[PDB]
C-alpha cells in the first residue's frame, strides 16, 4: 500500500512510493515530473478495474478509496488536429496511445488502415527500410493489429520500403493525419440502457456525447449544446438546448464515472 507501479506509454514501468493518504495529484505530480512532460495536459492515470475496464485516477481524492496500486499512463483528450500539438514527443505519446487502442479493439480499422498506419509505426520505429539489415521478417517483433496476420505483415513492409528521408517525427504526423480521421479515434465508451430498456454504447470525445446501438452511431450532442451534465445513483442526465436524455447504468459508479468524465471533456474542449 502506497507502492505505485505505473505502465508508461512505451511499455516501461515507473514505481514510485506516495504517502498512505496521498490524493492523485500526488502521484500524477511525479509521474509527470518522471517524464518531463511538456503538454501534460492531455494525459492521465488510469486504474483497471478488469482486463477491459477503466476508470480514471481522481487528482483530488485519496488514492487509497480508489484502488494493488497499479496504474496506466494514458492520453485521457485526444485532439481532434494532432499537428497543432507544439511539441513532437506529445505526438509520439498519442501515437502509443492509439497503438494501443488499435491492438486493443478499442479504434477498429479495415485492413488498408491497418497496413497504411503500420507502415508508419514500423517507418518511425526502424527508420528507412535497410535490405541489408532488416531482410523480409522484420515487423513480427511490433504489435499492428488485434489479429497480425503475414498478409497484413507483408502489405506494411511493401509500403515501409516505399519511403525515404522520413524521420519518426514526419511518420508520426502522417500516422495521425490518417488516425484522426478514423470514426472511433479518441473515443471513450460506456454500456448503458435507454429509457426503454434497450442496450446502448455511450461514447466520449472532444465533438460530444455519442449514442451507438451496435457500432451504428445514432445520435450526437455537441458539447457547445450541452447545458449540463449529471448523474443519480445508476441514471446519468444531459440537458440540451430544453430537455434532459437520461440513460440507466449498471451501477451507480459507472454513472459516476461517465459523469465525471463527460465534465473533464466539456471543459478541457470549451
Same mark, same amino acid.
Given at each position: 500500500?502506497?507502492?505505485?507501479?505505473?505502465?508508461?506509454?512505451?511499455?516501461?514501468?515507473?514505481?514510485?512510493?506516495?504517502?498512505?493518504?496521498?490524493?492523485?495529484?500526488?502521484?500524477?505530480?511525479?509521474?509527470?515530473?518522471?517524464?518531463?512532460?511538456?503538454?501534460?495536459?492531455?494525459?492521465?492515470?488510469?486504474?483497471?478495474?478488469?482486463?477491459?475496464?477503466?476508470?480514471?485516477?481522481?487528482?483530488?481524492?485519496?488514492?487509497?478509496?480508489?484502488?494493488?496500486?497499479?496504474?496506466?499512463?494514458?492520453?485521457?483528450?485526444?485532439?481532434?488536429?494532432?499537428?497543432?500539438?507544439?511539441?513532437?514527443?506529445?505526438?509520439?505519446?498519442?501515437?502509443?496511445? /492509439?497503438?494501443?487502442?488499435?491492438?486493443?479493439? &478499442?479504434?477498429?480499422?479495415?485492413?488498408?488502415?491497418?497496413? #497504411?498506419?503500420? !507502415? =508508419?509505426?514500423?517507418?518511425?520505429?526502424?527508420?528507412?527500410?535497410?535490405?541489408?539489415?532488416?531482410?523480409?521478417?522484420?515487423?513480427?517483433?511490433?504489435?499492428?493489429?488485434?489479429?497480425?496476420?503475414?498478409?497484413?505483415?507483408?502489405?506494411?513492409?511493401?509500403?515501409?520500403?516505399?519511403?525515404?528521408?522520413?524521420?519518426?517525427?514526419?511518420?508520426?504526423?502522417?500516422?495521425?493525419?490518417?488516425?484522426?480521421?478514423?470514426?472511433?479515434?479518441?473515443?471513450?465508451?460506456?454500456?448503458?440502457?435507454?429509457?426503454?430498456?434497450?442496450?446502448?454504447?455511450?461514447?466520449?470525445?472532444?465533438?460530444? /456525447?455519442?449514442?451507438?446501438?451496435?457500432?451504428? &452511431?445514432?445520435?450526437?450532442?455537441?458539447?457547445?449544446?450541452? #447545458?449540463?451534465? !449529471? =448523474?443519480?445513483?445508476?441514471?446519468?442526465?444531459?440537458?440540451?438546448?430544453?430537455?434532459?436524455?437520461?440513460?440507466?447504468?449498471?451501477?451507480?459508479?459507472?454513472?459516476?464515472?461517465?459523469?465525471?468524465?463527460?465534465?473533464?471533456?466539456?471543459?478541457?474542449?470549451?
Amino acid at each position: 500500500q502506497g507502492h505505485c507501479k505505473v505502465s508508461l506509454l512505451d511499455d516501461t514501468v515507473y514505481e514510485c512510493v506516495v504517502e498512505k493518504h496521498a490524493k492523485g495529484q500526488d502521484l500524477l505530480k511525479r509521474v509527470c515530473e518522471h517524464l518531463n512532460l511538456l503538454e501534460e495536459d492531455y494525459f492521465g492515470l488510469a486504474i483497471w478495474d478488469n482486463a477491459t475496464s477503466k476508470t480514471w485516477l481522481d487528482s483530488a481524492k485519496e488514492i487509497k478509496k480508489q484502488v494493488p496500486w497499479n496504474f496506466t499512463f494514458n492520453v485521457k483528450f485526444y485532439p481532434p488536429d494532432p499537428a497543432q500539438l507544439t511539441e513532437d514527443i506529445t505526438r509520439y505519446y498519442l501515437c502509443l496511445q /492509439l497503438r494501443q487502442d488499435i491492438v486493443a479493439g &478499442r479504434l477498429p480499422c479495415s485492413f488498408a488502415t491497418l497496413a #497504411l498506419l503500420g !507502415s =508508419y509505426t514500423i517507418q518511425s520505429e526502424l527508420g528507412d527500410y535497410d535490405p541489408e539489415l532488416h531482410g523480409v521478417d522484420y515487423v513480427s517483433d511490433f504489435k499492428l493489429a488485434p489479429n497480425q496476420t503475414k498478409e497484413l505483415e507483408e502489405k506494411v513492409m511493401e509500403l515501409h520500403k516505399s519511403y525515404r528521408s522520413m524521420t519518426p517525427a514526419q511518420a508520426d504526423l502522417e500516422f495521425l493525419e490518417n488516425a484522426k480521421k478514423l470514426s472511433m479515434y479518441g473515443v471513450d465508451l460506456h454500456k448503458a440502457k435507454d429509457l426503454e430498456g434497450v442496450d446502448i454504447i455511450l461514447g466520449v470525445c472532444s465533438s460530444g /456525447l455519442l449514442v451507438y446501438k451496435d457500432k451504428l &452511431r445514432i445520435n450526437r450532442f455537441p458539447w457547445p449544446k450541452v #447545458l449540463k451534465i !449529471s =448523474y443519480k445513483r445508476s441514471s446519468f442526465f444531459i440537458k440540451i438546448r430544453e430537455s434532459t436524455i437520461g440513460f440507466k447504468l449498471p451501477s451507480y459508479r459507472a454513472a459516476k464515472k461517465l459523469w465525471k468524465v463527460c465534465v473533464e471533456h466539456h471543459t478541457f474542449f470549451r
